[model samples]
Target: GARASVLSGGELDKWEKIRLRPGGKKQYKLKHIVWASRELERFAVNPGLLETSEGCRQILGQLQPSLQTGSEELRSLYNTIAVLYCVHQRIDVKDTKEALDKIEEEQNKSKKKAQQAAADTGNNSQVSQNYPIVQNLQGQMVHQAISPRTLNAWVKVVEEKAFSPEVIPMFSALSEGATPQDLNTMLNTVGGHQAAMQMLKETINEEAAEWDRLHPVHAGPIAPGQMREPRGSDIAGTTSTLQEQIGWMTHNPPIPVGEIYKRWIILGLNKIVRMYSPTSILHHHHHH
Candidate 1:
Protein backbone atom coordinates (compact mmCIF):
# COMPACT_ATOMS: atom_id res chain seq x y z
CA GLY A 1 0.00 0.00 0.00
CA ALA A 2 1.13 3.58 -0.58
CA ARG A 3 2.23 5.26 2.59
CA ALA A 4 0.03 8.00 3.96
CA SER A 5 0.64 11.19 1.92
CA VAL A 6 -0.56 13.39 4.72
CA LEU A 7 2.17 14.48 7.06
CA SER A 8 1.38 14.55 10.73
CA GLY A 9 2.77 16.26 13.87
CA GLY A 10 6.35 17.44 13.26
CA GLU A 11 6.36 16.21 9.69
CA LEU A 12 4.49 19.29 8.49
CA ASP A 13 6.73 21.52 10.54
CA LYS A 14 9.93 20.69 8.68
CA TRP A 15 8.60 22.35 5.52
CA GLU A 16 8.52 25.59 7.51
CA LYS A 17 12.27 25.60 6.99
CA ILE A 18 11.65 26.80 3.43
CA ARG A 19 12.44 30.52 3.17
CA LEU A 20 10.56 33.04 1.05
CA ARG A 21 10.48 35.44 -1.86
CA PRO A 22 11.37 39.13 -1.33
CA GLY A 23 8.14 41.09 -0.74
CA GLY A 24 5.63 38.28 -1.26
CA LYS A 25 2.45 36.81 0.02
CA LYS A 26 2.28 33.38 1.65
CA GLN A 27 5.17 31.54 0.01
CA TYR A 28 2.73 28.99 -1.36
CA LYS A 29 4.31 27.96 -4.67
CA LEU A 30 7.75 29.40 -3.99
CA LYS A 31 8.28 27.02 -1.13
CA HIS A 32 8.10 24.07 -3.49
CA ILE A 33 10.80 25.54 -5.75
CA VAL A 34 13.17 25.22 -2.82
CA TRP A 35 12.06 21.66 -2.28
CA ALA A 36 12.32 20.97 -6.03
CA SER A 37 15.82 22.43 -6.13
CA ARG A 38 16.67 19.37 -4.04
CA GLU A 39 16.44 16.98 -7.00
CA LEU A 40 18.98 17.16 -9.85
CA GLU A 41 16.59 16.48 -12.74
CA ARG A 42 13.69 18.49 -11.35
CA PHE A 43 15.93 21.46 -10.83
CA ALA A 44 17.37 21.12 -14.31
CA VAL A 45 14.02 20.92 -16.13
CA ASN A 46 12.62 24.15 -14.69
CA PRO A 47 11.31 26.75 -17.21
CA GLY A 48 13.26 27.15 -20.50
CA LEU A 49 16.44 25.52 -19.20
CA LEU A 50 15.96 21.96 -20.46
CA GLU A 51 19.59 20.94 -20.58
CA THR A 52 19.86 18.60 -17.60
CA SER A 53 23.67 18.84 -17.58
CA GLU A 54 23.55 22.61 -16.91
CA GLY A 55 23.02 21.66 -13.29
CA CYS A 56 22.59 24.12 -10.40
CA ARG A 57 23.91 27.54 -11.38
CA GLN A 58 20.51 28.33 -12.83
CA ILE A 59 18.90 27.05 -9.64
CA LEU A 60 21.02 29.08 -7.23
CA GLY A 61 20.41 32.10 -9.44
CA GLN A 62 16.67 31.46 -9.55
CA LEU A 63 16.60 30.95 -5.81
CA GLN A 64 16.16 34.70 -5.32
CA PRO A 65 13.43 35.18 -7.93
CA SER A 66 11.61 31.92 -7.27
CA LEU A 67 11.61 32.92 -3.63
CA GLN A 68 9.67 35.97 -4.85
CA THR A 69 8.59 36.02 -8.48
CA GLY A 70 8.14 32.59 -10.10
CA SER A 71 5.72 29.88 -9.07
CA GLU A 72 5.94 27.53 -12.02
CA GLU A 73 4.33 24.08 -11.81
CA LEU A 74 7.55 22.06 -12.01
CA ARG A 75 8.63 23.84 -8.86
CA SER A 76 5.42 22.54 -7.32
CA LEU A 77 6.64 19.11 -8.33
CA TYR A 78 9.78 19.51 -6.23
CA ASN A 79 7.95 20.41 -3.04
CA THR A 80 6.08 17.17 -3.42
CA ILE A 81 9.25 15.11 -3.91
CA ALA A 82 10.82 16.67 -0.83
CA VAL A 83 8.02 15.84 1.63
CA LEU A 84 8.33 12.21 0.61
CA TYR A 85 12.09 12.30 1.21
CA CYS A 86 12.21 15.16 3.70
CA VAL A 87 11.09 13.83 7.09
CA HIS A 88 13.00 10.63 6.50
CA GLN A 89 16.74 11.30 6.86
CA ARG A 90 18.28 12.73 3.68
CA ILE A 91 16.84 15.14 1.15
CA ASP A 92 18.49 15.58 -2.30
CA VAL A 93 18.76 19.42 -2.13
CA LYS A 94 22.50 19.25 -3.00
CA ASP A 95 23.17 21.82 -5.71
CA THR A 96 24.78 19.93 -8.59
CA LYS A 97 25.45 22.66 -11.21
CA GLU A 98 26.10 22.98 -14.97
CA ALA A 99 29.88 22.66 -15.08
CA LEU A 100 29.48 18.89 -14.82
CA ASP A 101 28.42 18.76 -18.50
CA LYS A 102 31.72 17.18 -19.48
CA ILE A 103 31.19 14.47 -16.89
CA GLU A 104 27.48 14.06 -17.65
CA GLU A 105 28.08 13.77 -21.39
CA GLU A 106 27.68 10.01 -21.52
CA GLN A 107 26.81 10.18 -25.17
CA ASN A 108 25.68 7.41 -27.45
CA LYS A 109 27.36 6.63 -30.78
CA SER A 110 25.26 6.87 -33.92
CA LYS A 111 23.48 3.58 -34.71
CA LYS A 112 23.86 3.79 -38.51
CA LYS A 113 26.09 0.74 -38.53
CA ALA A 114 23.70 -1.14 -36.23
CA GLN A 115 20.75 -0.30 -38.47
CA GLN A 116 22.73 -1.30 -41.56
CA ALA A 117 23.74 -4.60 -39.93
CA ALA A 118 20.13 -5.39 -38.96
CA ALA A 119 19.08 -4.53 -42.50
CA ASP A 120 21.74 -6.90 -43.81
CA THR A 121 20.49 -9.83 -41.70
CA GLY A 122 16.88 -9.19 -42.75
CA ASN A 123 18.06 -9.50 -46.37
CA ASN A 124 14.61 -11.11 -47.05
CA SER A 125 13.68 -13.94 -44.71
CA GLN A 126 10.11 -13.55 -45.91
CA VAL A 127 9.18 -10.05 -47.01
CA SER A 128 8.51 -6.58 -45.72
CA GLN A 129 6.88 -6.68 -42.30
CA ASN A 130 4.39 -4.19 -40.92
CA TYR A 131 4.91 -1.78 -38.01
CA PRO A 132 3.37 -0.20 -34.95
CA ILE A 133 0.99 2.80 -34.79
CA VAL A 134 3.93 5.10 -35.05
CA GLN A 135 2.97 8.41 -36.59
CA ASN A 136 5.25 11.34 -35.93
CA LEU A 137 2.54 13.89 -35.22
CA GLN A 138 3.61 17.50 -35.21
CA GLY A 139 2.23 20.18 -32.98
CA GLN A 140 3.06 21.87 -29.75
CA MET A 141 3.71 18.86 -27.59
CA VAL A 142 2.20 19.83 -24.26
CA HIS A 143 3.38 17.68 -21.38
CA GLN A 144 2.36 18.41 -17.82
CA ALA A 145 0.08 17.27 -15.06
CA ILE A 146 -3.67 17.91 -15.27
CA SER A 147 -4.85 20.97 -13.41
CA PRO A 148 -7.83 23.30 -13.67
CA ARG A 149 -5.69 26.30 -14.59
CA THR A 150 -3.88 24.50 -17.39
CA LEU A 151 -7.07 22.89 -18.67
CA ASN A 152 -8.73 26.26 -19.00
CA ALA A 153 -5.72 27.55 -20.87
CA TRP A 154 -5.78 24.52 -23.15
CA VAL A 155 -9.47 24.97 -23.89
CA LYS A 156 -9.05 28.63 -24.68
CA VAL A 157 -6.16 28.01 -27.06
CA VAL A 158 -7.73 25.09 -28.85
CA GLU A 159 -11.04 26.89 -29.22
CA GLU A 160 -9.44 30.00 -30.66
CA LYS A 161 -7.44 28.03 -33.18
CA ALA A 162 -10.28 25.65 -34.00
CA PHE A 163 -12.92 28.33 -34.61
CA SER A 164 -12.67 28.14 -38.39
CA PRO A 165 -14.27 26.21 -41.32
CA GLU A 166 -16.81 23.52 -40.47
CA VAL A 167 -15.07 21.73 -37.64
CA ILE A 168 -11.66 20.84 -36.28
CA PRO A 169 -10.42 17.83 -38.18
CA MET A 170 -9.17 15.80 -35.29
CA PHE A 171 -8.59 12.39 -36.85
CA SER A 172 -7.15 13.53 -40.17
CA ALA A 173 -5.05 16.17 -38.50
CA LEU A 174 -3.82 13.80 -35.81
CA SER A 175 -3.20 10.98 -38.30
CA GLU A 176 -1.47 13.09 -40.91
CA GLY A 177 0.01 15.20 -38.14
CA ALA A 178 -1.45 18.71 -37.99
CA THR A 179 -0.96 22.37 -37.56
CA PRO A 180 -3.61 24.85 -36.41
CA GLN A 181 -4.84 25.19 -39.97
CA ASP A 182 -5.10 21.46 -40.56
CA LEU A 183 -8.29 21.41 -38.53
CA ASN A 184 -9.81 23.56 -41.27
CA THR A 185 -9.02 20.88 -43.82
CA MET A 186 -10.68 18.34 -41.53
CA LEU A 187 -14.07 20.08 -41.88
CA ASN A 188 -14.16 19.57 -45.66
CA THR A 189 -12.89 15.99 -45.29
CA VAL A 190 -15.51 14.99 -42.73
CA GLY A 191 -18.66 16.80 -44.03
CA GLY A 192 -19.91 16.75 -40.43
CA HIS A 193 -18.87 20.15 -39.20
CA GLN A 194 -21.71 20.76 -36.81
CA ALA A 195 -21.83 17.15 -35.68
CA ALA A 196 -18.09 16.97 -35.05
CA MET A 197 -18.24 20.39 -33.53
CA GLN A 198 -20.84 18.98 -31.19
CA MET A 199 -18.55 16.06 -30.56
CA LEU A 200 -15.75 18.45 -29.69
CA LYS A 201 -17.96 20.23 -27.24
CA GLU A 202 -18.91 16.91 -25.68
CA THR A 203 -15.30 15.83 -25.49
CA ILE A 204 -14.30 19.12 -23.89
CA ASN A 205 -17.19 18.90 -21.43
CA GLU A 206 -16.29 15.32 -20.60
CA GLU A 207 -12.77 16.41 -19.77
CA ALA A 208 -14.11 19.27 -17.70
CA ALA A 209 -16.42 16.88 -15.90
CA GLU A 210 -13.60 14.50 -15.15
CA TRP A 211 -11.49 17.32 -13.81
CA ASP A 212 -14.25 18.52 -11.58
CA ARG A 213 -14.95 14.99 -10.41
CA LEU A 214 -11.31 14.68 -9.48
CA HIS A 215 -11.34 17.77 -7.29
CA PRO A 216 -9.76 16.66 -3.99
CA VAL A 217 -12.66 17.10 -1.60
CA HIS A 218 -14.85 14.88 -3.77
CA ALA A 219 -12.43 12.10 -4.71
CA GLY A 220 -9.53 9.99 -3.41
CA PRO A 221 -6.16 8.92 -4.84
CA ILE A 222 -7.70 5.72 -6.10
CA ALA A 223 -10.09 7.30 -8.57
CA PRO A 224 -13.35 5.49 -9.15
CA GLY A 225 -13.05 2.53 -11.56
CA GLN A 226 -9.32 3.18 -11.90
CA MET A 227 -6.90 0.41 -10.98
CA ARG A 228 -3.14 0.13 -11.23
CA GLU A 229 -2.01 -3.42 -11.92
CA PRO A 230 0.51 -5.64 -10.07
CA ARG A 231 2.19 -4.63 -6.80
CA GLY A 232 1.62 -1.29 -4.90
CA SER A 233 -1.99 -1.97 -4.27
CA ASP A 234 -2.34 -4.95 -1.93
CA ILE A 235 -5.44 -5.90 -3.88
CA ALA A 236 -3.26 -5.61 -6.99
CA GLY A 237 -5.23 -2.75 -8.45
CA THR A 238 -5.49 0.53 -6.53
CA THR A 239 -4.59 3.04 -3.81
CA SER A 240 -6.66 5.90 -2.51
CA THR A 241 -5.87 9.40 -3.80
CA LEU A 242 -8.14 10.35 -0.99
CA GLN A 243 -5.38 9.51 1.51
CA GLU A 244 -5.20 13.21 2.32
CA GLN A 245 -8.94 13.69 2.35
CA ILE A 246 -9.31 10.81 4.74
CA GLY A 247 -6.61 12.26 6.92
CA TRP A 248 -8.36 15.61 7.08
CA MET A 249 -11.64 13.91 7.81
CA THR A 250 -10.06 12.12 10.73
CA HIS A 251 -8.98 15.46 12.16
CA ASN A 252 -5.34 14.85 11.31
CA PRO A 253 -4.23 17.01 8.38
CA PRO A 254 -1.59 15.30 6.31
CA ILE A 255 0.83 16.83 3.85
CA PRO A 256 -0.61 19.50 1.57
CA VAL A 257 -1.73 18.61 -1.96
CA GLY A 258 1.65 19.20 -3.64
CA GLU A 259 3.60 16.93 -1.29
CA ILE A 260 0.84 14.35 -1.30
CA TYR A 261 0.63 14.47 -5.07
CA LYS A 262 4.41 14.33 -5.20
CA ARG A 263 4.65 11.12 -3.20
CA TRP A 264 1.93 9.60 -5.31
CA ILE A 265 3.80 10.62 -8.45
CA ILE A 266 7.03 9.04 -7.11
CA LEU A 267 5.47 5.72 -6.15
CA GLY A 268 3.57 5.59 -9.41
CA LEU A 269 6.72 6.48 -11.37
CA ASN A 270 8.83 3.97 -9.44
CA LYS A 271 6.43 1.20 -10.44
CA ILE A 272 6.32 2.31 -14.08
CA VAL A 273 10.11 2.71 -14.45
CA ARG A 274 10.77 -0.65 -12.82
CA MET A 275 8.06 -2.20 -14.93
CA TYR A 276 9.77 -0.90 -18.04
CA SER A 277 13.32 -1.67 -16.89
CA PRO A 278 15.24 -4.36 -18.80
CA THR A 279 16.08 -6.52 -15.80
CA SER A 280 12.56 -6.59 -14.43
CA ILE A 281 10.52 -6.67 -17.63
CA LEU A 282 12.96 -8.93 -19.47
CA HIS A 283 12.94 -11.44 -16.61
CA HIS A 284 9.19 -11.23 -16.25
CA HIS A 285 8.70 -11.76 -19.98
CA HIS A 286 10.95 -14.81 -19.87
CA HIS A 287 8.98 -16.22 -16.93
CA HIS A 288 5.68 -15.58 -18.62
Candidate 2:
Protein backbone atom coordinates (compact mmCIF):
# COMPACT_ATOMS: atom_id res chain seq x y z
CA GLY A 1 0.00 0.00 0.00
CA ALA A 2 2.89 2.36 0.71
CA ARG A 3 6.66 2.50 0.44
CA ALA A 4 9.25 3.22 3.14
CA SER A 5 8.84 6.70 4.61
CA VAL A 6 12.36 7.81 3.66
CA LEU A 7 11.79 6.90 0.00
CA SER A 8 8.43 8.68 -0.08
CA GLY A 9 8.29 12.10 -1.75
CA GLY A 10 6.86 13.71 1.36
CA GLU A 11 9.73 12.67 3.63
CA LEU A 12 12.23 14.07 1.13
CA ASP A 13 10.42 17.41 1.11
CA LYS A 14 10.38 17.38 4.90
CA TRP A 15 14.11 16.73 5.05
CA GLU A 16 14.86 19.24 2.32
CA LYS A 17 13.49 22.18 4.28
CA ILE A 18 15.80 21.70 7.26
CA ARG A 19 17.99 24.82 7.34
CA LEU A 20 20.19 25.41 10.35
CA ARG A 21 19.63 28.99 11.49
CA PRO A 22 22.54 31.36 10.89
CA GLY A 23 24.90 31.93 13.83
CA GLY A 24 23.38 34.45 16.27
CA LYS A 25 21.24 34.62 19.40
CA LYS A 26 18.47 33.41 17.04
CA GLN A 27 20.26 30.10 16.45
CA TYR A 28 20.48 29.41 20.20
CA LYS A 29 16.73 29.20 20.80
CA LEU A 30 16.10 25.65 22.02
CA LYS A 31 13.17 25.41 19.59
CA HIS A 32 15.21 26.36 16.53
CA ILE A 33 18.03 24.01 17.52
CA VAL A 34 15.52 21.20 18.02
CA TRP A 35 14.00 21.84 14.60
CA ALA A 36 17.39 21.42 12.97
CA SER A 37 18.27 18.26 14.90
CA ARG A 38 14.91 16.49 14.27
CA GLU A 39 15.63 15.78 10.59
CA LEU A 40 19.03 14.29 11.49
CA GLU A 41 17.21 11.90 13.85
CA ARG A 42 15.12 10.72 10.91
CA PHE A 43 18.31 10.34 8.90
CA ALA A 44 19.90 8.35 11.73
CA VAL A 45 16.87 6.16 12.40
CA ASN A 46 15.26 5.11 9.15
CA PRO A 47 15.93 4.46 5.44
CA GLY A 48 18.92 6.67 6.20
CA LEU A 49 20.31 9.79 4.52
CA LEU A 50 22.20 7.54 2.11
CA GLU A 51 19.48 5.24 0.78
CA THR A 52 17.56 7.96 -1.01
CA SER A 53 20.62 8.09 -3.33
CA GLU A 54 20.17 11.10 -5.61
CA GLY A 55 17.95 12.84 -3.11
CA CYS A 56 20.36 11.78 -0.42
CA ARG A 57 23.28 13.40 -2.20
CA GLN A 58 21.44 16.63 -2.90
CA ILE A 59 20.10 17.02 0.64
CA LEU A 60 23.22 15.98 2.52
CA GLY A 61 25.26 18.02 0.09
CA GLN A 62 23.43 21.21 0.99
CA LEU A 63 22.96 20.40 4.69
CA GLN A 64 26.55 19.31 5.30
CA PRO A 65 27.99 22.62 4.07
CA SER A 66 25.51 24.70 6.07
CA LEU A 67 26.09 22.61 9.19
CA GLN A 68 29.88 22.86 8.81
CA THR A 69 29.52 26.63 8.84
CA GLY A 70 26.96 26.38 11.61
CA SER A 71 29.44 24.43 13.70
CA GLU A 72 32.00 27.19 13.26
CA GLU A 73 29.40 29.66 14.41
CA LEU A 74 28.53 27.40 17.33
CA ARG A 75 32.20 27.31 18.38
CA SER A 76 32.22 31.10 18.65
CA LEU A 77 28.76 31.08 20.26
CA TYR A 78 29.88 28.60 22.91
CA ASN A 79 32.96 30.71 23.56
CA THR A 80 30.70 33.74 24.01
CA ILE A 81 28.39 31.72 26.29
CA ALA A 82 31.38 30.55 28.29
CA VAL A 83 32.70 34.11 28.61
CA LEU A 84 29.25 35.26 29.82
CA TYR A 85 29.07 32.42 32.34
CA CYS A 86 32.54 33.39 33.63
CA VAL A 87 31.47 37.03 33.92
CA HIS A 88 28.25 36.09 35.81
CA GLN A 89 30.18 33.73 38.09
CA ARG A 90 32.73 36.56 38.78
CA ILE A 91 35.64 34.58 37.32
CA ASP A 92 38.50 36.88 36.26
CA VAL A 93 38.62 37.74 32.51
CA LYS A 94 42.41 37.18 32.48
CA ASP A 95 41.99 33.61 33.89
CA THR A 96 39.04 32.90 31.56
CA LYS A 97 41.16 33.91 28.57
CA GLU A 98 44.00 31.66 29.77
CA ALA A 99 41.63 28.65 30.16
CA LEU A 100 40.09 29.30 26.71
CA ASP A 101 43.54 29.44 25.13
CA LYS A 102 44.42 26.07 26.69
CA ILE A 103 41.24 24.48 25.34
CA GLU A 104 41.76 25.96 21.86
CA GLU A 105 45.38 24.83 21.75
CA GLU A 106 44.39 21.29 22.72
CA GLN A 107 41.61 21.33 20.07
CA ASN A 108 44.06 22.46 17.39
CA LYS A 109 46.36 19.49 18.12
CA SER A 110 43.47 16.99 17.89
CA LYS A 111 42.13 18.63 14.73
CA LYS A 112 45.50 18.25 13.03
CA LYS A 113 45.63 14.61 14.12
CA ALA A 114 42.16 14.04 12.76
CA GLN A 115 43.14 15.63 9.44
CA GLN A 116 46.23 13.42 9.30
CA ALA A 117 44.14 10.28 9.95
CA ALA A 118 41.75 11.28 7.18
CA ALA A 119 44.56 11.71 4.71
CA ASP A 120 46.17 8.42 5.70
CA THR A 121 42.99 6.29 5.65
CA GLY A 122 41.18 8.00 2.80
CA ASN A 123 37.54 7.12 1.73
CA ASN A 124 37.80 3.36 2.31
CA SER A 125 38.36 3.86 6.01
CA GLN A 126 35.07 5.72 6.53
CA VAL A 127 32.80 4.40 3.75
CA SER A 128 32.26 0.71 3.25
CA GLN A 129 32.95 -1.08 -0.04
CA ASN A 130 29.59 -2.87 0.41
CA TYR A 131 27.43 0.23 0.75
CA PRO A 132 24.62 0.29 -1.83
CA ILE A 133 25.75 1.85 -5.10
CA VAL A 134 23.14 3.97 -6.84
CA GLN A 135 22.27 3.05 -10.41
CA ASN A 136 19.97 4.56 -12.99
CA LEU A 137 17.25 2.63 -14.87
CA GLN A 138 19.89 2.03 -17.52
CA GLY A 139 21.90 0.25 -14.78
CA GLN A 140 24.79 2.70 -14.98
CA MET A 141 26.52 4.17 -11.92
CA VAL A 142 25.58 7.62 -10.68
CA HIS A 143 26.86 9.35 -7.56
CA GLN A 144 29.35 7.75 -5.21
CA ALA A 145 27.27 6.60 -2.24
CA ILE A 146 28.29 7.20 1.37
CA SER A 147 26.99 4.79 3.96
CA PRO A 148 25.37 5.85 7.25
CA ARG A 149 28.76 5.20 8.87
CA THR A 150 30.33 7.80 6.63
CA LEU A 151 27.48 10.22 7.23
CA ASN A 152 27.71 9.82 10.98
CA ALA A 153 31.40 10.67 10.87
CA TRP A 154 30.72 13.65 8.61
CA VAL A 155 27.89 14.83 10.86
CA LYS A 156 30.10 14.63 13.95
CA VAL A 157 32.48 17.26 12.61
CA VAL A 158 29.75 19.51 11.21
CA GLU A 159 27.60 19.35 14.35
CA GLU A 160 30.56 19.83 16.71
CA LYS A 161 30.24 22.70 19.22
CA ALA A 162 33.27 22.52 21.45
CA PHE A 163 33.82 24.10 24.85
CA SER A 164 35.50 23.28 28.15
CA PRO A 165 33.76 25.03 31.03
CA GLU A 166 34.98 25.00 34.64
CA VAL A 167 31.54 25.84 36.16
CA ILE A 168 28.95 26.49 33.41
CA PRO A 169 26.33 23.79 32.69
CA MET A 170 27.15 21.78 29.56
CA PHE A 171 25.14 22.25 26.40
CA SER A 172 25.44 18.60 25.44
CA ALA A 173 22.66 19.23 22.90
CA LEU A 174 25.11 21.41 21.00
CA SER A 175 27.81 18.73 20.97
CA GLU A 176 28.82 16.46 18.09
CA GLY A 177 26.29 13.73 17.25
CA ALA A 178 23.86 14.68 20.05
CA THR A 179 20.95 12.26 20.46
CA PRO A 180 17.34 12.73 21.64
CA GLN A 181 18.55 12.17 25.20
CA ASP A 182 21.03 15.00 24.68
CA LEU A 183 18.21 17.18 23.32
CA ASN A 184 16.10 16.18 26.32
CA THR A 185 18.85 17.28 28.69
CA MET A 186 18.74 20.69 27.01
CA LEU A 187 14.89 20.55 26.93
CA ASN A 188 14.69 20.21 30.74
CA THR A 189 17.02 23.22 30.94
CA VAL A 190 15.17 24.92 28.02
CA GLY A 191 12.50 23.45 25.59
CA GLY A 192 11.11 22.42 22.11
CA HIS A 193 12.81 19.24 20.78
CA GLN A 194 9.49 17.41 21.13
CA ALA A 195 7.67 20.26 19.41
CA ALA A 196 10.12 20.00 16.53
CA MET A 197 9.44 16.25 16.30
CA GLN A 198 5.65 16.81 16.26
CA MET A 199 5.98 19.48 13.57
CA LEU A 200 8.11 17.14 11.43
CA LYS A 201 5.47 14.41 11.73
CA GLU A 202 2.64 16.79 10.76
CA THR A 203 4.52 18.19 7.77
CA ILE A 204 5.45 14.73 6.44
CA ASN A 205 1.84 13.52 6.82
CA GLU A 206 0.43 16.54 4.99
CA GLU A 207 2.92 16.22 2.13
CA ALA A 208 2.39 12.45 1.89
CA ALA A 209 -1.37 12.94 1.85
CA GLU A 210 -0.95 15.50 -0.91
CA TRP A 211 1.33 13.09 -2.82
CA ASP A 212 -1.13 10.19 -2.43
CA ARG A 213 -3.92 12.30 -3.88
CA LEU A 214 -1.81 13.03 -6.94
CA HIS A 215 -0.47 9.50 -7.49
CA PRO A 216 -3.39 7.32 -6.50
CA VAL A 217 -3.76 3.61 -7.20
CA HIS A 218 -7.15 2.06 -7.91
CA ALA A 219 -7.96 -0.10 -4.87
CA GLY A 220 -9.83 -2.37 -7.27
CA PRO A 221 -13.56 -2.82 -7.96
CA ILE A 222 -16.07 -3.39 -5.14
CA ALA A 223 -16.11 -6.72 -3.29
CA PRO A 224 -15.48 -9.63 -5.63
CA GLY A 225 -17.30 -13.03 -5.70
CA GLN A 226 -20.36 -11.93 -3.73
CA MET A 227 -23.76 -11.99 -5.41
CA ARG A 228 -26.13 -9.05 -4.90
CA GLU A 229 -28.91 -9.66 -2.35
CA PRO A 230 -32.38 -9.73 -3.84
CA ARG A 231 -34.64 -6.92 -2.63
CA GLY A 232 -38.14 -5.88 -3.61
CA SER A 233 -37.25 -2.16 -3.52
CA ASP A 234 -34.16 -2.56 -5.66
CA ILE A 235 -34.68 -0.50 -8.80
CA ALA A 236 -32.42 -2.38 -11.23
CA GLY A 237 -32.56 -5.84 -9.69
CA THR A 238 -35.60 -7.23 -11.56
CA THR A 239 -37.26 -7.11 -15.01
CA SER A 240 -40.35 -9.07 -13.83
CA THR A 241 -42.60 -5.99 -13.96
CA LEU A 242 -41.61 -5.35 -17.57
CA GLN A 243 -42.18 -9.04 -18.46
CA GLU A 244 -45.56 -9.05 -16.74
CA GLN A 245 -46.74 -5.99 -18.76
CA ILE A 246 -45.77 -7.74 -22.04
CA GLY A 247 -47.40 -10.97 -20.91
CA TRP A 248 -50.69 -9.13 -20.06
CA MET A 249 -50.74 -7.60 -23.55
CA THR A 250 -50.05 -11.01 -25.15
CA HIS A 251 -53.39 -12.29 -23.69
CA ASN A 252 -55.43 -9.35 -25.24
CA PRO A 253 -53.64 -8.61 -28.48
CA PRO A 254 -55.01 -7.35 -31.85
CA ILE A 255 -52.68 -7.80 -34.89
CA PRO A 256 -52.34 -4.06 -35.60
CA VAL A 257 -51.81 -3.16 -31.93
CA GLY A 258 -49.52 -6.16 -31.40
CA GLU A 259 -47.29 -5.16 -34.35
CA ILE A 260 -46.68 -1.68 -32.92
CA TYR A 261 -46.18 -3.05 -29.35
CA LYS A 262 -43.86 -5.80 -30.60
CA ARG A 263 -41.73 -3.31 -32.51
CA TRP A 264 -41.45 -1.05 -29.45
CA ILE A 265 -40.75 -3.98 -27.10
CA ILE A 266 -37.99 -5.38 -29.36
CA LEU A 267 -36.26 -2.00 -29.55
CA GLY A 268 -36.59 -1.47 -25.79
CA LEU A 269 -35.27 -4.97 -25.04
CA ASN A 270 -32.20 -4.39 -27.20
CA LYS A 271 -31.53 -1.05 -25.52
CA ILE A 272 -31.88 -2.59 -22.05
CA VAL A 273 -29.57 -5.46 -22.95
CA ARG A 274 -26.92 -3.15 -24.28
CA MET A 275 -27.12 -0.85 -21.24
CA TYR A 276 -27.31 -3.42 -18.45
CA SER A 277 -25.44 -6.53 -19.57
CA PRO A 278 -22.33 -7.09 -17.37
CA THR A 279 -19.83 -6.93 -20.25
CA SER A 280 -21.63 -3.96 -21.82
CA ILE A 281 -21.72 -2.17 -18.48
CA LEU A 282 -18.01 -2.73 -17.91
CA HIS A 283 -17.10 -1.64 -21.44
CA HIS A 284 -19.34 1.41 -21.20
CA HIS A 285 -17.59 2.58 -18.06
CA HIS A 286 -14.05 1.57 -18.98
CA HIS A 287 -13.92 2.56 -22.66
CA HIS A 288 -13.72 6.18 -21.60
lDDT of 2 by residue, 136-250 (tens): 3222122222245544443443334211121012232232222222222332343223443344334433433443456444554646532222122111113223223223223
Provide C-alpha RMSD values for all models, in order.
25.6, 34.8
- On residues 148-182, what C-alpha lDDT tens digit does candidate 1 reach at each position? 54334434534544333211332222323221222
TM-score for candidate 2, please give it: 0.15
- Candidate 2: RMSD to truth: 34.8
Q: What is the TM-score of each candidate against the true structure?
A: 0.16, 0.15
Q: C-alpha displacement of 162 in model 2, angstroms?
A: 45
Off by over 4 Å in 1: 1-5, 20-71, 90-288
